[PDB]
Design a protein around this nucleic acid. Sequence first.
DNA 1: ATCAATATCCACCTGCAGATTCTACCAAAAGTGTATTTGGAAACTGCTCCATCAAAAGGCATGTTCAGCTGAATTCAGCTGAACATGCCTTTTGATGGAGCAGTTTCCAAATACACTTTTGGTAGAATCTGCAGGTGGATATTGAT
DNA 2: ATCAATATCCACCTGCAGATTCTACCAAAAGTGTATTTGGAAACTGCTCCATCAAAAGGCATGTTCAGCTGAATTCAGCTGAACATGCCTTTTGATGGAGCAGTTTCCAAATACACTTTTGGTAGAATCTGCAGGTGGATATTGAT
Lengths: 109, 105, 83, 87, 98, 99, 94, 94
Amino acid sequence: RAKVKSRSSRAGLQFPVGRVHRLLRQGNYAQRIGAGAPVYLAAVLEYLTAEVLELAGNAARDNKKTRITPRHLQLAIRNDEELNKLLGRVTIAQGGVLPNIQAVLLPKK
Amino acid sequence: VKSRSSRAGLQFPVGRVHRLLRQGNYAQRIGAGAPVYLAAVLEYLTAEVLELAGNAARDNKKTRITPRHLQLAIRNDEELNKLLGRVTIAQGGVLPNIQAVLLPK
Amino acid sequence: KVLRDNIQGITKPAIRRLARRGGVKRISGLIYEETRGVLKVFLENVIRDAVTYTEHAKRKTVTAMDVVYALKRQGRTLYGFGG
Amino acid sequence: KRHRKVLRDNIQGITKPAIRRLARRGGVKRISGLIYEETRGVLKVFLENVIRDAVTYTEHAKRKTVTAMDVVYALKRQGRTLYGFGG
Amino acid sequence: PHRYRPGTVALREIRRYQKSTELLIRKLPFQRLVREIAQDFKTDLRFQSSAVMALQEACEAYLVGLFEDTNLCAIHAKRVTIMPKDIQLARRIRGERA
Amino acid sequence: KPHRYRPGTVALREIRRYQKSTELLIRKLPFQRLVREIAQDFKTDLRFQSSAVMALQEACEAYLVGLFEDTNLCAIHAKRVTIMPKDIQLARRIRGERA
Amino acid sequence: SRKESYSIYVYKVLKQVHPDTGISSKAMGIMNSFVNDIFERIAGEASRLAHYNKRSTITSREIQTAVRLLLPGELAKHAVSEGTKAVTKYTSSK
Amino acid sequence: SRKESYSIYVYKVLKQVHPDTGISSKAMGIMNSFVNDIFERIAGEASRLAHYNKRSTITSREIQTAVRLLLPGELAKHAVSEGTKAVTKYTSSK
DNA sequence: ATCAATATCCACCTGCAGATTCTACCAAAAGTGTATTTGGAAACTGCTCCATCAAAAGGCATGTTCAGCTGAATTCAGCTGAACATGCCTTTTGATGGAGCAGTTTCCAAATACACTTTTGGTAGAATCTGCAGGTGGATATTGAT
DNA sequence: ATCAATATCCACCTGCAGATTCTACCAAAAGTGTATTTGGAAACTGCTCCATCAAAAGGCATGTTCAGCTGAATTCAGCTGAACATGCCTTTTGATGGAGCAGTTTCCAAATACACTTTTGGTAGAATCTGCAGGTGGATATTGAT
Ligand SMILES: [Cl-]
Ligand SMILES: [Cl-]
Ligand SMILES: [Cl-]
Ligand SMILES: [Cl-]
Ligand SMILES: [Cl-]
Ligand SMILES: [Mn+2]
Ligand SMILES: [Mn+2]
Ligand SMILES: [Mn+2]
Ligand SMILES: [Mn+2]
């Protein structure tokens, strides 16, 4: 008799491998879901969460505030160039724009 | 034996359209009206672009629809424009259009 | 004698304080009307798609998810409200 | 056992007269001299990005021939859906 | 009396709002506007509090973003003032109108 | 004793000539080589359906032409009549392509 | 071997609206792509509707709200028309 | 009854990459919408991959090509990596 | 660029409610175990469809000349829109009461899923037709020079 | 305004490719009968969401003054278009050897289908915290005058 190790930790992940599997079965994405697919994806989602999370927290502490607001997450994503395309046609609530004024508009001396 | 497609007074193959709903995995299950209603919408639409196109075929003094004509059709008709904005018609051309300021005068 | 559509309730200064967030040094007087026009179109067809969602679901209250599904539908995917 | 010949620098085969011809159909009366290089600039990015996806479709499918479907599947993927080749 | 010359609060104002994140249209003028646009599609509709801010959020975003994109067009024509002429070019390139 | 047309006048004359047609405008073998090159540089040792090259050339000319009018609108917007890079960059920036 | 198309149906519907007009093979091609494209968008947009509403099946109603969502204006309206009761003619026979 | 979220997993991974960093509730909100979107895109793109090649199932192999298409540049490759890296570690489930 | 002067910013400090996080239990997933079913990987192998290759030609690109007209640069009047104080009002805010609905259990009839068995519509080459692309020369129009 | 110089239009011809037709073999609807879930239809709540309600806050409209900007007008250098001569290379066509689909078959390795056993992910209260909301007071910026 051999008992429970979550498959998510068998893959060394924080993200829920099991759930992601349930979610792919119930998405109508294909007839059958291979047992590696949900781990791989969970990894990819966990990874991606990680990547914007550090870049945002950086901008979070840069803003001299302890935690992460949508503001920071925006500053994070829009200043990073590789996240800007993945999230180009996505709008971040309560985010703002990056401060940006055109050269031509500024005073002269 | 009587097919469902003529049973609904359609040219389009309701039978197939049902089957083609088998692999989008668009859902677990397909209701029996879905292929009929839809196959109808496709038949309606192919029909609608077919007239506007054939017109341009005959303005052009030709018996046969070229992709050209289909373009003249899709782009000059404005509701059909919009459904097909982000689509490119092979061998199609553009609509003849010169900007006002460019013409001599 | 203030009988005026609420589109004009979109007060003038407020219409574009935005333009500055948009990065604009100075704006024409015509711009406000033209703007109020675009504002309305934008949200008209959005609420139209949002609502058929409310309607397909046989509901009588528009929920934020209907909005979200619709924004996505329009290619204006919004994060922070359920998808 | 016959490999040749190196393909290098083929972007300049997109001749200035041809760049012109595309441009007229676009309805352009007059073109700056810089426009041609810029254009070649823009064409090659475009054609890279498409062929990158076309090919990723070809290899996932474990073929070694790019098929028009791959092209089409890729173009569509770019939101530049093309009619007249298989979808 | 003494004060600032034209254009200068504007920059002072631009940096202020780019600095902030707050909503800029007001809530009830908007809400009123929203339900009005709504009722005209289906009668007897009500709305989640959340679903209204959802819409203000989407709009203000769309609009601000509507330009940075023309301000580029106003600047493109050796100008510094946005005009209707400019917005239409923005939307026509984006594919909203021709 | 010999001349024919003023500057600008055949320009329009060809706009009307090409807008009337549907032929591809890039030459076929030059396009193909370029394609094969970009490909080969992406993964080696590939082949191509005649079909899939035209797919690409049709798609391209479509793309480029469509930008050119978007460009031309930008040139005309700035009281100019000649397209410049300054224009193409504005077109792709608004399109959102990321130049 | 076995490639299947919509081209007969287009040709059928072609003789209905322009009896003395025909269609080139490359134009017929384009018509297919038009059919197939139009098909997934509708079928797809339906698919996620069922899914947003936690129901497991696509009924004619989904195909419809789909059409309502994705077709513009009047051909959306002549579609639901020409469409909704392609379906009774089907359910009024037995 | 109550719906379910990704916030614990996000908060967990958050404490790992920045041990001294919390997360606002609506910032958690955004992060949640983000996972979801990305989830669908990949899942969709794979779904459609699987389908072009007349294969009935989605394997990790499809999810990968999915990432290849849809994730940009270098962010694509740390992704293929952390994934095949999570997947072998899983199959070594002894 | 500096001097003097309104006028706006920006760190430094700080105590509190409104949030964020932490704690303390419960169905609902997820994980197992055992049992079956199947999709698609390997292994041939038939057969297109691709890659070169060559020859000749004539379409088309390139490189050069010459000028016209476009883009850019300066100047300048006038009118538009920014800046602000001013004064009245719409919007905010804070609960609040109650009907209105979405959210769900529970429970069957209707609708759809399987698994075969005829039966027929669609497809793939071969059999006929026959639009129209391309080559004309004759006209009309447009263009540009006197 | 006339007159020369092309270019565009446009009707007729005609053999060929590409369309249309016609026949014959097989995958795919359709037809039956039995096998399983669902999406309501009735019955019921919790929770948001509407309608008021009423004090004050700043926000908005309004009107005034001036600046600077936008639009116009002229001038000019030089760039880009039109024309030609020259000649390369693409285009055509036709052949041919072979790599590589794709079409079939065969057999595991892998996924699904149920049945229970654990475990976790999430709530609603209970226990901690930090931007804020706001009061300064010190600098940076901006402006008009020397
Ligand atoms: Cl409950
Ligand atoms: Cl038959
Ligand atoms: Cl002859
Ligand atoms: Cl033949
Ligand atoms: Cl503060
Ligand atoms: Mn797998
Ligand atoms: Mn019978
Ligand atoms: Mn190379
Ligand atoms: Mn200080």
